[PDB]
Nucleic acid binder design. Structure first.
Lengths: 118, 49, 112, 102, 145
RNA sequence: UAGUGAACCAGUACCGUGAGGGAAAGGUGAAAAGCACCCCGGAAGGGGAGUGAAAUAGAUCCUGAAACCGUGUGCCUACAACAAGUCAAAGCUCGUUAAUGAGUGAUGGCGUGCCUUUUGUAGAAUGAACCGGCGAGUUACGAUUGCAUGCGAGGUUAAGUC
RNA sequence: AUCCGGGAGUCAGACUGCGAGUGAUAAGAUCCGUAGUCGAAAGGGAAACAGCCCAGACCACCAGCUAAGGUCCCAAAAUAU
RNA sequence: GGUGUAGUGGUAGGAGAGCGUUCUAAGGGCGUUGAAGGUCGAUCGUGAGGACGGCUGGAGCGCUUAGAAGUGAGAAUGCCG
């Protein structure tokens, strides 16, 4: 009942190495050091699936900043006026409307001018 | 009942512990014994009483 | 119809780093000039690749090709052969090994 | 023809004759889907969105029920002993678009 | 992966602006100028591409230094040799090399990427009141900032 | 690398004056039919032509992984401080177990490896040159509890004979 | 929460509000009583930072709101009244 | 099966369910019209892991239920090549 260790280890180690195509050194072809940056790549993937959302809110805020300042409104009085006008647009949608549709962004800008004018 | 369809009595033949066989089984790296001390050496433990 | 005869020489008793120096100077040239190129380098790896190219020319004549004046050295390799292993008595009792290495050399002679 | 439609938590830009990749909708393939909350109607004369602009039904049909790629989310903590291993693969429904307000 | 604009290199047109400096302090000139060059005041960011503009400066430098700091803000350079600190400047750079004031107190205001170099070579600082760059038709800003 | 130390001309070669210590080394093909003859070279070695179902089965001879050494080419690279990844992304090249495709990657954000021992580690505490193979809670006889089974005021054989 | 029974690890703790000694009414010193965090806890802030202030991640999203702390540029938001 | 409400960081350690290797038994199978082994692929499951296809290979091996273990490697200034 002598059991050798025939073909298990190759299957493990090559499933590791296919996760490591394109590593900028001898981290293609060394088993002890390929099994480490895969671990750190998983830590960084856990971080970075949660810093997508930290990033794009800052980008859409900056684009809302520029396009709002073009119409004589600072970048927060839009927020307070649009909530007094009871409008619930996501910051993505105001970002790309602020880039493309100048007419629509000025229409929302004038209703936000009218809202807090009371 | 015949040879190729055997069934045991339920709840009546357990499996085992295989101790010191990997960190996520629960009992690898010091095998259920812990850190240093003479209970964790080879054949340690004082006599009874 | 085939061109590009081959010629090898296996387990040549020369070190494989040094023979890659000479084959820097041959890849991509005409045959009739590269022999003259080989005849002036003063190395042990000079007087071997001569014999490889001349056997490749003789293969292309007596087997397939024509037109010796229209042959181009297209490919040339250096690979490592098996290594002998011996020792040397170094001072204060001990000993340190000595490798002795061998190489395989191939040259392919296309027409154009 | 713009339409900005609340679907789930998210907001989507909508045109005529495209596809949107949205979450599950409990509707068989295939059939008709009628979204209701519409903020904007664009184009030329912008219907500015008071929340639930009235009389704004955006219709559509369904093509598949499919899944994204896996998301290998392994956690470890160094110089200690831990392995949590998962795999997650959400379902997805394509949405053809037809017939903004007319 | 969905729809937000990621501008390319040759999509955004650039402009040319002219800014005076008659009796405005350093920090606020440098702040408005450095917020110009990254591409702010334009709704079409990337954090990749030079979406910024070109800025020309007239009358370097006549910049104020508020209260004191005429003789006080000592700059410092060290020359990687022993004892080589050279505090050679003061507020003396108002008189000589008034190019060199704004080319330091704006380079500090920028990032230090490679874009903090391609966005720095768009300044032009002149202590006098002349454009050699009149071939490019620059416009005028108004600073109430 | 198992199984005697040893499947092979082994207590042999080798080491110590001596008592003594002690290795490594299996495999062509069904059949040797083991490459007549020609060609370069002093030969070794190769290229044709043959033998053979197969010669990348040519005597180091079944299959032939990894480190390691080379050749050719799709994309990038000479104002740049980089635990070497990951998120975002232009361009160029390609076309799959057809699907929210594959290769590369100018550029921006963020980011001090792996074990062990510790009140505490990136540590200038301690271990690994790299790859492959071997390499650690078992068994016998007793004791105690949980679960299951057959009988139950009863239960049950040992040594030993066929 | 109590009782009966099977199975262990632990006996080198640390700093910070507090309140007391020996110290010189000194120390990231030492020795105890009380509460928290680290040990066995990842995310935000104090430039970076085990123990301080806020808050305890089953997983995905290019959705929304607030705490501690912030709003001239790096670097997100007031050159606010 | 619905539908609600609640919970789901974690070292030493306690408990439960599974993946994988070699052999034995019984049933049922595959294989010179290509088995094991090797290489490549843009595939499936929550996990260890499992299929199918292209090439190389040239004689044996999976599948279901039960049983027995020389049953799983990255670290010992580990041993051998």
């Amino acid at each position: 009942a002598r059991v050798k260790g025939g073909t298990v280890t190759r299957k493990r180690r090559k499933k590791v190495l296919k996760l490591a195509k394109g590593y900028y050194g001898s981290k293609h072809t060394l088993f002890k050091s390929a099994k480490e940056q895969v671990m750190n790549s998983y830590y960084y993937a856990f971080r970075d699936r949660r810093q997508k959302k930290r990033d794009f809110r800052k980008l859409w805020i900056a684009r809302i900043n520029a396009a709002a300042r073009m119409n004589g409104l600072s970048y927060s009085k839009l927020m307070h006026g649009l909530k007094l006008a009871e409008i619930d647009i996501n910051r993505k949608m105001l970002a790309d409307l602020a880039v493309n549709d100048a007419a629509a962004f000025t229409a929302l800008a004038e209703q936000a001018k009218d809202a807090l004018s009371k | 009942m015949k040879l190729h369809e055997l069934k045991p009595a339920e709840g009546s033949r357990q499996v085992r512990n295989r101790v010191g066989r990997g960190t996520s089984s629960g009992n690898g790296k010091t095998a259920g014994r812990g850190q240093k001390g003479q209970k964790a050496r080879s054949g340690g433990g004082v006599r009874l009483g | 119809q085939i061109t590009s005869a081959k010629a090898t020489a296996k387990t040549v008793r020369t070190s494989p780093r040094k023979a890659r120096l000479v084959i820097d100077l041959i890849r991509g040239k005409s045959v009739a000039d590269a022999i003259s190129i080989l005849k002036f380098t003063p190395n042990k790896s000079a007087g071997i690749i001569e014999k490889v190219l001349m056997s490749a020319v003789a293969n292309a004549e007596n087997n397939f090709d024509l037109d010796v004046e229209s042959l181009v050295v297209s490919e040339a390799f250096v690979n490592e052969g098996p290594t002998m292993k011996r020792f040397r008595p170094r001072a204060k009792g001990s000993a340190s090994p000595i490798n002795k290495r061998t190489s395989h050399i191939t040259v392919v002679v296309t027409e154009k | 023809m713009y339409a900005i439609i609340k679907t789930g938590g998210k907001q989507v830009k909508v045109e005529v004759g495209q596809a949107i990749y949205v979450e599950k909708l409990n509707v068989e393939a295939g059939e008709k889907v009628v979204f209701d909350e519409v903020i904007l109607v664009g184009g030329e004369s912008t219907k500015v969105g008071a929340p639930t602009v009235a009389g704004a039904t955006v219709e559509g049909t369904v093509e598949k029920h499919g899944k994204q790629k896996k998301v290998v989310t392994f956690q470890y903590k160094p110089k200690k002993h831990s392995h949590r291993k998962q795999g997650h693969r959400q379902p997805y429904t394509k949405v053809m678009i037809e017939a903004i307000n007319a | 992966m969905r729809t937000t604009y990621m501008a390319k290199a040759g999509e955004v047109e650039r402009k040319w602006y002219v800014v005076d400096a008659t009796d405005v302090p350093l920090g606020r000139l440098s702040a408005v100028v450095a917020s110009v060059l990254r591409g702010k005041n334009k709704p079409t960011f990337t954090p990749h591409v030079d979406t910024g503009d070109f800025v020309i400066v007239i009358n370097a430098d006549k910049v104020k230094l508020t209260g004191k700091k005429a003789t006080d803000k000592i700059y410092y350079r060290h020359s990687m040799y022993p004892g080589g600190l050279k505090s050679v400047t003061a507020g003396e750079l108002r008189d000589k090399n008034s190019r060199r004031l704004i080319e330091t107190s704006v380079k500090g205001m920028l990032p230090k990427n490679t874009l903090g170099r391609k966005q720095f070579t768009k300044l032009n600082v002149y202590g006098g009141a002349e454009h050699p760059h009149a071939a490019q038709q620059p416009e005028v800003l108004d600073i109430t900032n």
